[PDB]
Amino acid sequence: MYHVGDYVYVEPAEANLQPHIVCIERLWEDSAGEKWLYGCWFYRPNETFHLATRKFLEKEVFKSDYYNKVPVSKILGKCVVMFVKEYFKLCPENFRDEDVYVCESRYSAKTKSFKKIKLWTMPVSSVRFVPRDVPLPVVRVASVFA
Ligand SMILES: [Cl-]
């Protein structure tokens, strides 16, 4: 069911936290027959430390430097992360908009720093992208602090 280049929701370690968004970079099984994936975590805005004034696109995520392995049994479903240069003009067939995210920047969880992406270099999956019949508004909003 899963292929390299797919993005998946992975069960968090604490139940009921938001699932992690992971791009599958490798798949294998161990001698026990347990199936595993390895990939890059994409962080939601509240998983990063950022200037309180920073504005986020709705559905923004950040390509992180955190990579890990998890059993394929921890997958909750598929999703898609699109590079910002394509997200506004194209959308992925067979995905609900709630499961389509946009990525403009990397975030390092080592240094708590952001950097704009110049070249998108993720593995190519079988997702099929078509031009949007309805362009998405560019809409950026900051976090709310009590
Ligand atoms: Cl920031």
Swiss-Prot record:
Residue spans making up a coiled coil are none
Residue span(s) of domain BAH: 1-118
Superkingdom of the source?
Eukaryota
Localisation: Nucleus
Extent of the signal sequence: none
Tell me, in a sentence or two, what this protein's role is.
Involved in transcriptional activation and repression of select genes by chromatin remodeling (alteration of DNA-nucleosome topology).
> What subunit structure does UniProt give?
Component of the SWI/SNF-B (PBAF) chromatin-remodeling complex.
Name of this protein: Protein polybromo-1
Write the span of the intact protein that is present: 955 to 1100 of 1633
